[PDB]
Design a protein around this ligand. Structure first.
Ligand SMILES: OC[C@H]1O[C@H](O[C@H]2O[C@H](CO)[C@@H](O)[C@H](O)[C@H]2O)[C@H](O)[C@@H](O)[C@@H]1O
Ligand SMILES: OC[C@H]1O[C@H](O[C@H]2O[C@H](CO)[C@@H](O)[C@H](O)[C@H]2O)[C@H](O)[C@@H](O)[C@@H]1O
Ligand code: LU2
Ligand code: LU2
Ligand code: NA
Ligand code: NA
Lengths: 309, 307
């Protein structure tokens, strides 16, 4: 009944891209269709990796197979890490088509560009993707989940405070999407030093017809490791819970963040047991414990409340 | 914990191959790794389909990545439909090496060759695949799920009766596999014309060699479903894993799971198509996602009899 077209990476071993997004959305009842934009043995954080990349002509072929069977009717599109400009442009063309087929289609975009490590911001994708994201992808997106670095790149503005972040989210709203969620490890938290800040803003038209905006903030005590695939799972769960709670960004974000916390907590406890006391766990040991978190995906216990902005 | 390497087709829309096998095994708690041997828009029962095939060099490249990371430690391998002889030969090489890494690895093989339509056999794969299955795949496999037609092709004999099928299953056992399930047949059922027979045979140690043989008579729901054999092999893997000494219960849970999925699928297909209208392939896609709770704990709706 609720159809999602997810165009993301596939790995054999582990949970990133479509492997992070598909099982949880299926567990939540979505008819999610996975276009695998790469097929790799494992993610590129390992010592070794091999695989094959889907090119934009092949992506167009697969969409053509859907169109010919009148199977190009989706409720959502979901994208994330995209490596190639020609590929991103074909994704744009497909989303435009799908939005003409279904004007109510919701495009959820994780605009993966890069991140910051201890002051150095640096990108993960070719720099020539940024104009495509600015002029073609973000204007088409309805929900975007930039981290702070990508929100800065997309807006052209450095963020030094919650104030400036909220201004950047307004800037992002004006570029296209009605829902903007920024994640940041660099904004300060009154709760401590290992906290992640989530800022969410959603504009909607209420039953009376007025355009209003709900703004929220979460201060999350991180679990004591860094993982691969976290942003992919975040965007997938944000899709799921905004779908279930379309007019309640606070609840949507609380369920999203609580799902991630349960998965990551379980993952770090399993990784440390495999690694041993004091031993730094490997990337293999840090793979998200996705199938073991089924019950937390289905009904996450809320472990952090958002504050109203 | 329990890791499965599944080398099968991927489709964007629908449930065949790895799309039929992965979600249910994930729901049941297996760490299933999906090697997509093709990526097509949909299965070939539709009017159109587009996509790309994984070749044997690309399969080897993928496995090398796993091996370089010391990630080639699996508890199960699972395969089904393969069109390409060199690809199937690569799979055998990989399974051989995974068995060297883990001697207790269980290879579950659906030896997809063809099927009978009105008693008439017709084939799904090129002829040169049959020698590969007979001489390389089946000898390596530990659990196989041929239909009757495939059992006849692999063994070289016709099956006209239960007794003949069980003798053919014994020949398959002697070729390698300790578990053989003939998943559909033309055999008659006392329950009526609208039933098919499923027969299972498992060789195991109690520490003597003992045999368990079972039979089930299953009311065949009337529709052409795709991916049924893929789901059957995946759930046989799952339930023989949970019940290693009880083929009867493993088969009851497998068939019951299929029943719940297919029953839900035909109820939905008939509602979308309307009274009288034969449903389309798109309306008949397995309602996999909506069957999550039946997969988790299938209500037993069929009893197997121990032979
Ligand atoms: O829409 C189909 C089913 O969706 C719901 O159930 C799923 O989503 C829930 C959260 O919204 C999960 O808790 C649950 O585990 C999923 O199965 C709905 O509750 C079901 O009745 C529908 O069948
Ligand atoms: O081994 C991991 C889990 O496996 C079981 O749970 C799964 O399998 C059950 C059937 O064997 C399903 O009923 C259940 O929904 C699955 O989650 C086992 O019962 C659990 O304890 C394990 O965590
Ligand atoms: O909810 C959480 C959301 C995120 C997150 C979200 C988006 C990203 O692009 C990212 O890199 C991390 O990270 C977490 C890290 C945590 O340790 C705990 C958490 O709850 C979260
Ligand atoms: O358990 C069932 C198993 C299957 C089946 C299994 C393997 C195949 O290669 C195949 O072509 C069909 O077929 C069924 C058809 C049914 O209508 C109901 C069922 O329960 C089954
Ligand atoms: Na993100
Ligand atoms: Na079969």
């Amino acid at each position: 009944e609720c159809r999602v077209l997810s165009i993301q990476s596939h790995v054999i071993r582990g949970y990133v891209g479509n492997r992070a997004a598909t099982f949880p959305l299926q567990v939540l009842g979505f008819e999610i269709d996975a276009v695998n934009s790469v097929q790799f043995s494992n993610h590129t954080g390992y010592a070794h990796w091999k695989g094959q990349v889907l090119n934009s002509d092949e992506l167009q072929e697969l969409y053509e197979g859907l169109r010919l069977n009148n199977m190009n009717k989706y409720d959502y599109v979901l994208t994330g890490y995209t490596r190639d400009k020609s590929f991103l442009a074909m994704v744009v063309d497909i989303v435009q088509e799908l939005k003409q087929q279904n004007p109510r289609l919701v495009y959820v975009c994780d605009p993966v560009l890069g991140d910051k490590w201890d002051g150095e911001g640096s990108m993960y994708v070719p720099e020539d993707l940024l104009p495509v994201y600015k002029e073609k992808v973000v204007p088409l997106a309805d929900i975007i989940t930039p981290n702070q670095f990508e929100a800065e790149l997309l807006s052209g503005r450095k963020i030094h405070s919650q104030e400036e972040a909220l201004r950047v989210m307004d800037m992002l709203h004006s570029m296209g999407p009605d829902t903007v969620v920024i994640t940041s490890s660099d904004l300060p938290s009154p709760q401590g030093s290992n906290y992640l800040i989530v800022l969410g803003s959603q504009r909607r038209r209420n039953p009376a017809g007025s355009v209003v905006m709900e703004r929220i903030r979460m201060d999350i005590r991180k679990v004591d490791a860094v993982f691969v695939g976290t942003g992919d799972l975040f965007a997938a769960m944000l899709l799921a819970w905004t779908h279930k709670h379309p007019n309640n960004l606070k609840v949507a974000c609380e369920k999203t963040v609580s799902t991630l916390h349960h998965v990551l907590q379980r993952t770090i406890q399993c990784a440390k047991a495999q690694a041993g006391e004091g031993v730094r766990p490997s990337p293999m040991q840090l793979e998200l414990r996705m199938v073991q978190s089924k019950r937390d995906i289905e009904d996450p216990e809320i472990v952090v409340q958002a504050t109203v902005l």
